[PDB]
Design an enzyme around this catalytic site. Sequence first.
Site, short mmCIF file in Angstrom:
data_model
loop_
_atom_site.label_atom_id
_atom_site.label_comp_id
_atom_site.label_asym_id
_atom_site.label_seq_id
_atom_site.Cartn_x
_atom_site.Cartn_y
_atom_site.Cartn_z
N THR A 76 -15.96 -4.46 0.31
CA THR A 76 -15.03 -3.88 1.19
C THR A 76 -13.93 -4.93 1.50
O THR A 76 -12.72 -4.51 1.46
CB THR A 76 -15.64 -3.30 2.45
OG1 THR A 76 -16.31 -4.20 3.25
CG2 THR A 76 -15.12 -2.06 3.05
N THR A 77 -14.31 -5.71 2.47
CA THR A 77 -14.12 -7.11 2.55
C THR A 77 -13.18 -7.70 1.50
O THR A 77 -11.99 -7.61 1.62
CB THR A 77 -14.50 -8.00 3.63
OG1 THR A 77 -14.64 -7.43 4.89
CG2 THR A 77 -14.62 -9.42 3.47
N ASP A 100 -29.06 -0.14 -2.22
CA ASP A 100 -27.87 -0.86 -2.69
C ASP A 100 -28.29 -1.91 -3.72
O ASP A 100 -27.60 -1.82 -4.79
CB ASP A 100 -26.95 -1.37 -1.59
CG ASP A 100 -26.35 -0.42 -0.72
OD1 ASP A 100 -25.73 0.70 -1.00
OD2 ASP A 100 -26.39 -0.58 0.58
N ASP A 138 -18.70 -5.42 9.32
CA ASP A 138 -18.64 -4.89 7.94
C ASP A 138 -17.31 -4.10 7.92
O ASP A 138 -16.86 -3.72 9.10
CB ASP A 138 -19.80 -4.12 7.64
CG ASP A 138 -20.35 -3.72 6.27
OD1 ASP A 138 -20.19 -4.47 5.24
OD2 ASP A 138 -20.94 -2.66 6.22
#
Lengths: 491, 491
Positions: free
Chosen positions: A87-88, A358, A54
């Site tokens: 993010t990613t 989330d 992540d």
Amino acid sequence: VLPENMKRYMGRDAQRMNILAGRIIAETVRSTLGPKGMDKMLVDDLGDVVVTNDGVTILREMSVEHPAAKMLIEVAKTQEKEVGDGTTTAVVVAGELLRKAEELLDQNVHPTIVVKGYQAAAQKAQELLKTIACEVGAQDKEILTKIAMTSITGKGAEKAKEKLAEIIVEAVSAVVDDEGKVDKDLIKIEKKSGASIDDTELIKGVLVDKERVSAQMPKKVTDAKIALLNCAIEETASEMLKDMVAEIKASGANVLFCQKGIDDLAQHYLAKEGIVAARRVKKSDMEKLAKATGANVITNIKDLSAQDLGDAGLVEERKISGDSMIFVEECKHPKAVTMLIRGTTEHVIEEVARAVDDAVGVVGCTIEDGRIVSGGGSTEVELSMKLREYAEGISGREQLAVRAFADALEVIPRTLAENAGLDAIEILVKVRAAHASNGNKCAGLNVFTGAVEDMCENGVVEPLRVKTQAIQSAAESTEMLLRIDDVIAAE
Amino acid sequence: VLPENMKRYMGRDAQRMNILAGRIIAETVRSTLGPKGMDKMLVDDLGDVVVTNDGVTILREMSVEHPAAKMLIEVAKTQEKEVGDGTTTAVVVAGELLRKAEELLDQNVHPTIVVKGYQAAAQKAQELLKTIACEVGAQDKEILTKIAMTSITGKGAEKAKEKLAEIIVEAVSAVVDDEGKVDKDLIKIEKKSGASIDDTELIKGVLVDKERVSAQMPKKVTDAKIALLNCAIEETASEMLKDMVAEIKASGANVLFCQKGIDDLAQHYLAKEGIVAARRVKKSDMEKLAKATGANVITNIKDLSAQDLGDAGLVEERKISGDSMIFVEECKHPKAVTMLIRGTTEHVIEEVARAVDDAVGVVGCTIEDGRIVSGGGSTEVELSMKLREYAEGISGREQLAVRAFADALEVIPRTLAENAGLDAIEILVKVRAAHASNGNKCAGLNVFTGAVEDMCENGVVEPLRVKTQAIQSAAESTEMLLRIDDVIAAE
């Protein structure tokens, strides 16, 4: 002329150092996004050894050298604290972006012009991202459980997803007052062993981390009036500690949770009268047990009193997979609700704890925006074939901006194909063609069988604040990093 | 399997060496094409020093090493046989079409893909050229002049293009029978010193390069009966020599042109009567003077007759540049047609004699085919935005190829403008956008301005065979090339 740290790089020299840094940590992050990737193992310094996929963390640990390369953590960092998801995405396409901005700058572009493209193709992109948007409004349940399932994918269980996206929609549909503000804090997630993935339940109230004090105190009460003391029922031995206990049984409690403990001989009095009591209990504890049960939270144990005090539909101490905890169900007016999560190990419980937090977040996004997109790569190809056709509208150098920034939107639908051992250039054609003609909705890259699909009718789909932030905060971050031309280095 | 002569390559090993092949030869002669292109200095193993622009002869003299390099002379060599200009054209974007291709067998597609493209996009490109065709008629005169001046472009008088265009039109609308076949050999091009670029004149007849042998003859004849001998005025002394010259007088001949000589007691005899005669005159100027005159070309002298013989208003021996020449004007039935050429020296002369022979070829092309098509760069641009769009059409592999062959078609009008100095981003935007909206006839690349141009209305346009031949010849000879996949070499 300078001193203090000084080795100096404009122009080509510059290009090299800021491209290599940004290319790097992209490569890093390329193969961690979605269904088709893959795990990484860190090790620092302390020789300590750390698997993760992540993107934030991943660049956190790795002590960096390139200062320019340090300003890019910064752009994954402000995508996790905010929205979380992506993010990613913000980042990767922030390095790709740059590769493509190299081909030009080697055409001696006036870095000037290339930015004058990717700004007006950020902007337009906003007008695009907003229409492919396939509006379905806020508390419709169908779609709530399609935004919730996408909250649960690529995960150690996306399996559960249909039972982890139910008692979630019931738990945020139950928290939010005046449709269009969207509270997290309220939904706790407890994690206990034993079950399967689908035996997760939603107790309209509060499930804390709490024994019965006194071994005295009846191990279950029926229609209970729970007290909240955050402050002392400690005084020093005999008298003081008796006057505090005979004033709880004076007002109307059977049930008591005190953020400030209990002595021995004061639980012996509590259980003398039929008062159960819960020791050391956390202030996290306290506020949840307040809105569960219905409580107004007091200071001390010495104000404890039936009136600032709760109503609760069962209260047993239940040992659950070899640990005792206090349940508080049938709740009258829960703002705020706990979801018991049955579970595997602590690891698949935690996750179905994060696959709700989330989830409640991301639906607190379809409150405030009851938009819904674009089943991962989807909206990319759409933005593609729009913004290509947009380009035949600009003219000059800014032509070559906006074309490049579309064709790099095909970065992400690409890698999630490749990662999948797929022919890219077949599917690309498949999805593009099917998006200009079906809509927002219909037009996907499913991993699995390998062909275009209704992320909608699956649905497989994610909220809209997710896609929005991920692309803006990224896009403008890498045009900063675009634009410093001069690097005088040093420590 | 193996030796004498052989090392072997497959893979990227071959791939490289052919490509290198390729790009190089090309790198050489890209520069030479168009308004905006420069010379080159050749030297052979002899030592000889050699300065030319034209891409056939460039590649013909340098002793080339790479076999695959050897495949590629034969593709500019055939283009020169046909048309002429396109040498250049056929073979550069042969070399370019390779370099792109690269980016793909690197790729890793299956060279079977590439080619799948390039052949549907050569087809198609047939359908396109066809259309950007702008309409007009056989002996239209504005469009005769246009196609004439664009047979006179980027050469040593493009000078007198206007004057070089109008005497050629005249000369080829003179020659043709049954409109739709244009014969060449019959327009002779005679060079002499002294004029300017515009004083170039069409004597509907023939002008040869003989003077009047024998001083006794007739320095001018009025309405003359020319006689055409291919056969020897040649007999052994006294007698046999005079009843051959008494035989010419016995028919009708004022005038005579013999393939073969004349011995000095012979021309003393033809001058005795008033007979003029012309010495050592070739086969050449034999079936010239016969289309001029109106002759039918016989064997010997003897042969000579009234008959078999011509009619020609004016036949005077005129010193020109201080070289004796014999003129043969007001011809009654001229099928064939000398066009006197005055300029500057020998070069400017011969050059308008080349700038009419290509001009009689391409002429001969708009006779047979009625089309005209723009330089420099209408038909490029227009194929671009059509064959781009035609991609979206196609689907798979073949997408890729036909986008890379339409992009290919831009580099000539890019360089074009570079050559200038000539930021090509703007213009290309200019000329493209203009073409999709005006047409075939008016979307140019005029070097001089700097701007999109009505090729037509200005003048500046080529024929149809030039761009048809160009195209196809070049496109399938670089496909070919792109096939070979195994080199074993050599001795």
